[PDB]
Amino acid sequence: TSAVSLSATGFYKTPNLGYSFETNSGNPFHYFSYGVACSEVEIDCLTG
Amino acid sequence: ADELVFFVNGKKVVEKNADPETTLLVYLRRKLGLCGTKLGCGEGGCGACTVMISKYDRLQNKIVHFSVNACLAPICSLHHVAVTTVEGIGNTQKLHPVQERIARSHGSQCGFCTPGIVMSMYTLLRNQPEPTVEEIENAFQGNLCRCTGYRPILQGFRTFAKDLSPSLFNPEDFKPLDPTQEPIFPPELLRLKDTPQKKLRFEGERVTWIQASTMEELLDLKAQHPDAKLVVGNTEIGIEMKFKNMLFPLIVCPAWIPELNSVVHGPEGISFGASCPLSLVESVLAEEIAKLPEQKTEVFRGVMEQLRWFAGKQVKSVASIGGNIITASPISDLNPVFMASGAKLTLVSRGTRRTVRMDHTFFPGYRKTLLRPEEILLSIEIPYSKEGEFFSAFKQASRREDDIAKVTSGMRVLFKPGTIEVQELSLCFGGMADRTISALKTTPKQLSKSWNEELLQSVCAGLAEELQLAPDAPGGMVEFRRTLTLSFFFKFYLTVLQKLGRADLEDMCGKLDPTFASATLLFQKDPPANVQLFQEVPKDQSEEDMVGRPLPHLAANMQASGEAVYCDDIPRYENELSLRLVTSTRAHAKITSIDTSEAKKVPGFVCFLTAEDVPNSNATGLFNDETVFAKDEVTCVGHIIGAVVADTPEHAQRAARGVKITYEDLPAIITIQDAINNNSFYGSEIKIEKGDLKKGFSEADNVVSGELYIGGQEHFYLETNCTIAVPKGEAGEMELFVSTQNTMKTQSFVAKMLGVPDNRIVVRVKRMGGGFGGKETRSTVVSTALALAAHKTGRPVRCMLDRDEDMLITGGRHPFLAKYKVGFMKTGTVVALEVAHFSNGGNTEDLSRSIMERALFHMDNAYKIPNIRGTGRICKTNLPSNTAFRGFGGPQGMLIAEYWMSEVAITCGLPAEEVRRKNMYKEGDLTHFNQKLEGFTLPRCWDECIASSQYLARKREVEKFNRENCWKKRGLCIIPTKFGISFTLPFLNQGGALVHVYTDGSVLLTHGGTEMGQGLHTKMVQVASRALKIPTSKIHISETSTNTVPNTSPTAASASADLNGQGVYEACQTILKRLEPFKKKKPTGPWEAWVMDAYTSAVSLSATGFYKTPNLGYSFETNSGNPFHYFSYGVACSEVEIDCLTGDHKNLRTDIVMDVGSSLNPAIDIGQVEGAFVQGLGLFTMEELHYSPEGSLHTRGPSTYKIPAFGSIPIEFRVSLLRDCPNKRAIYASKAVGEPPLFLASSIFFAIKDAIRAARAQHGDNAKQLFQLDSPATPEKIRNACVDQFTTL
Amino acid sequence: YTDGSVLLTHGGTEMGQGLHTKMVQVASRALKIPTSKIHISETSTNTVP
Amino acid sequence: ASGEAVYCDDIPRYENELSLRLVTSTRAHAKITSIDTSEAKKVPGFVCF
Ligand SMILES: Cc1cc2nc3c(=O)[nH]c(=O)nc-3n(C[C@H](O)[C@H](O)[C@H](O)COP(=O)(O)OP(=O)(O)OC[C@H]3O[C@@H](n4cnc5c(N)ncnc54)[C@H](O)[C@@H]3O)c2cc1C
Ligand SMILES: O=c1[nH]c(=O)c2[nH]c(=O)[nH]c2[nH]1
Ligand code: FES
Ligand code: FES
Ligand SMILES: [Ca+2]
């Protein structure tokens, strides 16, 4: 009722990225994910 | 099991189970998917459904083409014919010349009437490739357009005929017509023309249709089954079936029978088979009249005179003469003529044949004839006139009731040869009784009398007595109708005088006084002359900057082609249901019970929805005082009680008829007077007051007091209200496609009814076929009901209202009652004014209060009044709720001002234009509400109009015409206007937009405004193209949606281009800012490179835009603050000529000068001036709504509610937009245009008033000087004010 | 909207990963209102290009 | 879990809606020497290839 807009756009771009294959420089990634898994199996040597 | 076989746009249709109730319009739209042909009324009056038919005519041996109303053509009547629709002539990839010309000439605004007009013009050209201007105009008698003011349509099409300012269009650029490229007549049909016609039978759900090939077959059928209903053109039967609930289970169509279609010239006259269409009657009698002695064709000319203002080409091409005769309507225009001339009817049944002579016994009772149930009408011989035998025919114009109370007459005299003495005299009338009658007691008494003043006087006394009407007779207008019988005989009397003159009996009968001659003239057209003037843009302006250029409406080509999509053109989902509203038949009552037992038996019935089914809240409407569905009590005729849902529209309608509802009446408050007496009002008195009233009236040389009533108005948007609601099945989500100016309120009201948040509900509007205020709020009454059905069923549901329903339910402009007192000097200067206003608001508040405020804000019109008091009360009544209508209270307020102003001038004995001018504000003055008038261009508009209309010189001609004519009079008036721009509710002055640029460079824009024919999207694209500096071609607007721009105000208050234009401009400035760094690097490289560079640099190419009108907000308590951002100004000068004997009148010339600031688009803005002016013209002169004494609307369609027609517009029609007047506070210095010109049509009202004043000085005797003329000034009111020997006794 | 409800959309599409769920959680923290007041209906080229 | 969620094919058909079926290569690498559509044209409701 005060005539203020209640609609908005939003935007984002990941900064500082850019790798060069020619000079082997520049960051391709913003950050890295990391994890580790331990697994155990039992095989049947006669069937696969 | 007979197949029905016909062609549509060249393609063969084979219908194996044709239902006789199926119309061609329904079949085209719903079976074939061809939605260019529209429904606008369903009763033959609007022509929106016009299509062309071609066939091989076996009787004339050749291919013929004619137009028809698709809404009334049973498909069962169409075996072996070829239909052509708008889609069959061209499309946007190759427009037919007819489509091209109407588009390019700015003849299409909302676009809904465009296809039907295109088809009427197209059919004309297939028959006459080189028509005349006259033929072109006659082509459209059956086509209505509510937006354009008709001028541009006729002007564009005039290019097919007569065989400083830039221009609005260029005819030299129009492609030429090549007739060889029209569609081939289907060769299959030429093959079949050879084989004999067989009787067919078609069986539908309820109706059996036999297409009789032979007289034998028809007679056998009627002998054995006398109940079999003849249908020939269906132009009466269709109405009875569709709107009067009637059902004839067995129908026989005899249209193919050679004997019913023959024309035979015999010694006494010409015989027409009874099934001959009126169009064949017309072309034969025309040619007889052209080639024969005048003395023989007197009757033929009377028939032709009646066929002139009868219906359109569409109706006449299939309406039979026998059908008019046998329908026996009390207001048949033809039967009075056939009766007066003793036309010879042959009747037959199996083994019988007899001839009679139409006389009073032919019609023994209401809609009855002499025919036995087994007989049919074979032929009517229309007779040659004899030496000494003379004939006139007459017809009231104006029509108010379905069936009754329009006068129409046939009159005949035979003189003993060589004498002036009467051998035979016959005077027959419709609209005076429940059937066509003969003045049988009056005529005998004049036998052997001489044609003289004694006979005139004798016949008038007889007529008055013999045809006398009770004060309460059916149809009212009893004083007018009486006067017409007498006035029509007078004309006949004078005309026979003349005709005896021409037979050299002048010395026995006398000369006619030459001031009486104009009384007897047959209506003569006069060729149209138009001028449109506007301003060229600067010479330096880029060619790609379209702001200020006359760019055609961006959808005009698709509208001409039938490709533009309106709501009901959207294809149905396979699971879609249809809804039909059930409304109250009482003005105020308790609902005692509802029985749906008959409704449940209709096949496809799904449910009846009522208030109990509403999920959340039944309280709706702008001020929360309305029911979605009535609960316990109805409060108008039209109050929506519930809604039937069924698989198809036909089943919904039949099922709604089986909802039987039971009432106990309650005290009803109907009229403004009823409300005043009962203290029934919406809220308190509203008031504006300035200066000292007691002093002003004390200082005034004169004081005049009076009242004025102003009738209401139906919007008659060509597209009625329509909603499709589509439930999505998740989270309460629903999408609605609606013909509405108000997406926001539609969304909110739906969400509150359902009890879900607003974020679940999306409302979409591509375009409306007109709105005009009618769809600002009252569209939600359909929307909420449909949304509920969709929610309940989980299925898509659709409702488009029939015209009768829409006219009943949705209300109109507010009627006004004013009580005024004005005080003024001898010089004409007004010093004091007090006006009490009352409006009839109907049964909901809606916008009624804001409407009253606008009327009060305009009670000054253009005039500075130092001491002033206005009040208004808004009456609360048991009628449909009235709402916004273009003007929004302004026109009512300003008509009241001009009305007391007219009386100030007459009381001072001074020229009205001088009096207006000297009371006009000047630059810097304050209004009565204390707003200052800056940039006041009204005097410039006034002076330009006075000069270019040659007002003073025309005044002198009008005076002279009036001194030289006793029975016609002219009048001339010039009227100004001032119109405040912005919503009366300040926070509604806001708008938003959203813009995207895609990586190809193309731009998708949207904004809060909706397109309803005013060219808003076009304007926004013009604006965006200038703002962005790219061509309009790269910018597109597809639709309006609550999920792209939220919280939008309705498209109203003429404000939408101002508000959305600023929103658009700001959205565009945001995008330009972000592209700036790329522009700098690449200042030449094209737009597409900047866009792609920004994209690949990860810069956002999407933006919102928003505007609020600043510094607004008026206070009623302190009478300060600005309610308006700026004001519109304009002046119109109009001239009229009235028929003092009939009440009819011609609009001879109108000249308008309008301040639209620096127009965004002068083509669209001129079109809005003309459109608005013509709606005003209807408001003040033609449009009259009529109600039973118990509050039931009788006037529900174009047969009874008469909007301006092609033939209504001023014959010379000039419009200029004021030059050099930038308004820099609105978008690119424009002004809004939609509403301000409407009130300028009051110029025609006041010109009629001048003409009446002159008629009164001519024949009045003691006439009251300040006589009464309420609005609308219809033929009734004009005729009754022309007091004379005929009105007095 | 004027009832306080929020309609949100973004470029991302839901394919089972709970993107919309995460976006509403994000919006509700950002706006400091409950997730119940925020809805995402769909992804469309005419709302985010 | 309720089957209320709408995926593309769950959307109701329009009454006038048509169906498409792709026609693909049965060869890894080849010239197309001709296409014969005569048998396809005889299937009821066939519109176009
Ligand atoms: C938009 C519009 C405007 C109109 N304007 C006017 C006007 O200005 N003035 C005026 O007088 N009329 C007017 N009419 C009425 C019109 O002239 C009649 O509707 C028309 O002539 C009826 O003919 P039809 O062939 O359509 O009859 P249908 O509707 O097919 O038949 C109407 C009646 O005639 C009967 N019938 C037809 N032929 C025969 C026969 N040979 N023997 C026995 N019974 C028969 C039918 O059983 C039926 O009862 C208007 C109608 C429309 C739709
Ligand atoms: O001030 C106005 N408010 C409205 O809501 C409206 N609607 C309309 O048609 N004209 C106007 N004027
Ligand atoms: S819809 Fe057919 S004449 Fe109006
Ligand atoms: S353009 Fe003719 S009705 Fe709208
Ligand atoms: Ca109201």
CSV table of C-alpha atoms in Angstrom, one decimal, chain B residues 731 733 744 747 757-760 994 996 998 1004 1039 1042-1044 1046-1047 1101-1102, chain C residues 1-7 9 36-42 45-49:
chain,number,residue,atom,x,y,z
B,731,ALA,CA,-0.1,-28.5,-3.3
B,733,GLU,CA,-1.8,-25.4,-7.4
B,744,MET,CA,-4.4,-9.8,-9.0
B,747,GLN,CA,-5.9,-14.6,-8.0
B,757,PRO,CA,-2.1,-19.2,-0.3
B,758,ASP,CA,-1.8,-16.8,-3.3
B,759,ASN,CA,1.5,-18.5,-4.3
B,760,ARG,CA,-0.4,-21.5,-5.5
B,994,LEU,CA,9.9,-8.0,-16.2
B,996,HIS,CA,14.7,-11.0,-20.3
B,998,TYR,CA,18.1,-14.3,-24.4
B,1004,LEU,CA,10.8,-11.2,-23.9
B,1039,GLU,CA,1.1,-12.6,-22.1
B,1042,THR,CA,0.6,-13.1,-11.8
B,1043,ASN,CA,3.8,-15.3,-11.8
B,1044,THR,CA,5.9,-13.0,-13.8
B,1046,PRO,CA,2.9,-9.8,-9.0
B,1047,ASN,CA,0.5,-7.5,-7.2
B,1101,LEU,CA,20.3,-10.5,-18.5
B,1102,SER,CA,17.0,-10.4,-16.6
C,1,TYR,CA,2.1,-11.6,-2.7
C,2,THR,CA,0.0,-9.4,-0.6
C,3,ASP,CA,-1.1,-12.3,1.7
C,4,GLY,CA,2.6,-12.7,2.6
C,5,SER,CA,3.0,-15.9,0.6
C,6,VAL,CA,6.2,-16.2,-1.5
C,7,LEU,CA,6.5,-17.7,-4.9
C,9,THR,CA,11.7,-19.9,-8.9
C,36,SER,CA,5.5,-23.2,4.9
C,37,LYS,CA,5.2,-19.6,3.5
C,38,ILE,CA,7.5,-20.2,0.4
C,39,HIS,CA,6.6,-22.3,-2.6
C,40,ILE,CA,8.4,-23.4,-5.8
C,41,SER,CA,6.1,-24.6,-8.6
C,42,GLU,CA,8.4,-25.1,-11.6
C,45,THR,CA,12.7,-20.1,-19.3
C,46,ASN,CA,10.2,-17.2,-19.1
C,47,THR,CA,10.9,-16.6,-15.4
C,48,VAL,CA,14.7,-17.1,-15.3
C,49,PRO,CA,16.5,-16.9,-18.7
